[PDB]
Design a protein around this ligand. Sequence first.
Ligand SMILES: Nc1c(O)cccc1C(=O)NS(=O)(=O)NC[C@H]1O[C@@H](n2cnc3c(N)ncnc32)[C@H](O)[C@@H]1O
Ligand SMILES: [Br-]
Ligand SMILES: [Cl-]
Ligand SMILES: [Cl-]
Ligand SMILES: [Cl-]
Ligand SMILES: [Cl-]
Length: 389
Amino acid sequence: HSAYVYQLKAVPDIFDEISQRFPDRVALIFDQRKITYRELAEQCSALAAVLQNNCLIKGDIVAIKIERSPELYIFMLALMKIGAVMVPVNSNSPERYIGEVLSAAGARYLISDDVTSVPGGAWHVLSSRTLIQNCTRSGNYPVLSADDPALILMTSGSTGKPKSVLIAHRGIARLGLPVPALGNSERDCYLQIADISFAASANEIWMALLTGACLTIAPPGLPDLMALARQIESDNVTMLFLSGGLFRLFVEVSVETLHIPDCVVVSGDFVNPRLFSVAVQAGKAKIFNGLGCTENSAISSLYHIQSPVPVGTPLPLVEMVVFNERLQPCTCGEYGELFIAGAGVALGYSDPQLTAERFITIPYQGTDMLFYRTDDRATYDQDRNIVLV
Ligand SMILES: Nc1c(O)cccc1C(=O)NS(=O)(=O)NC[C@H]1O[C@@H](n2cnc3c(N)ncnc32)[C@H](O)[C@@H]1O
Ligand SMILES: [Br-]
Ligand SMILES: [Cl-]
Ligand SMILES: [Cl-]
Ligand SMILES: [Cl-]
Ligand SMILES: [Cl-]
């Protein structure tokens, strides 16, 4: 439990720390089933021992296709504890496409809650249901470092090129640091709705579970705004992360739901400023425009809208710089490209040539800093907020 904020542990070590400090806080809610950190840590450890005894070891590439459920997050924590590299799969994807993802990721195993609706291939299919039943063993787990790989996520460039992104423990472990703009703590409650195959899901999962906060879990499948509205109220969601689609739809059909939480973060793409205007005038929740990208593991900057919206200022341990064509920091109003450095930067792509092109070391403020090149055109405003253009 170090006070040096730049000193990060692997995910399982942070979670062990949190589960010891807040053992009687609620970690997970699904429907009306609630699970404390103490019970979650017991289930995580029991499952990790089962996985190790199934010969799964550090660095094994392990895909997960498990519908939203408490067991999904138990598997994530157990796989992190044994050092496996998770490949989360979109359960709403054609089997065809899932096979292409598993192939591109090099998955050796696929853990599934429905072993009938999975693609065949080189990978070996394991039943999440059977493995959970075999929980009764725990010890001799790997000594993980913040730079060990934790997951593989798929993304695309601006012109459609598909990419396989290797994410380090540190990229999600940083979400255990409270975000000053949000004021979050263990008292908060998050809503898990973004699909696990999307980096944005990390915002919900790990900001909750690595801080002692509560994660209430949306029902599997496509968004049910009626149920989500009831869930936000009945489970007292206080930190609400939304895609541009979910945000816009809520503004259109139930803007007052957006003011049940304390903070609402909209990320993923440009949002019509008029939508922010309506939302901000409808109540007193803090509405943010947020930037994230897969290559920085999770949400990366926040702009509080008070009334092209800026993307604001970086999260803890994140560095953002707009660089011109000559790799010099831009002045206010000068156009350049957004580069991101710090704890969230990915380990690379599966493509080594693509990695060297997009992950570049640049001396900045006295440090030879590794930057991800976003391909996002940007500048600074007068208050030095970053604004994508
Ligand atoms: N939403 C996410 C999250 O919360 C956590 C982690 C990842 C993501 C995510 O979106 N990852 S991603 O799929 O790789 N897309 C990346 C690309 O999205 C565009 N983008 C994203 N946010 C904004 C925004 N506010 N305004 C304008 N453009 C935006 C930029 O072009 C960027 O480079
Ligand atoms: Br739109
Ligand atoms: Cl407690
Ligand atoms: Cl198919
Ligand atoms: Cl291509
Ligand atoms: Cl790649």
